Nucleic acid binder design. Sequence first.
DNA 1: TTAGGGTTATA
DNA 2: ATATAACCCTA
Length: 53
Amino acid sequence: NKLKCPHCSYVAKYRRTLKRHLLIHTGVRSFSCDICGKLFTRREHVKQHSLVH
DNA sequence: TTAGGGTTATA
DNA sequence: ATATAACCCTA
Ligand SMILES: [Zn+2]
Ligand SMILES: [Zn+2]
């Protein structure tokens, strides 16, 4: 099943949502806050976090 | 707030 | 079909 995660029982409705979900198992955090240096998994998370500054 | 589930739009 | 994006919801 191309919609099933190879690392857990999660099954996505769309292929793009499975690819996003894979990042929970790799731990990759490609986004950062320029003010405090904290790392984030999505760029929407940075915008959400920016409100503390 | 954090973080990952959901969704829809555009190319 | 993929790539990137954005916005909402919730524990
Ligand atoms: Zn998984
Ligand atoms: Zn910060």
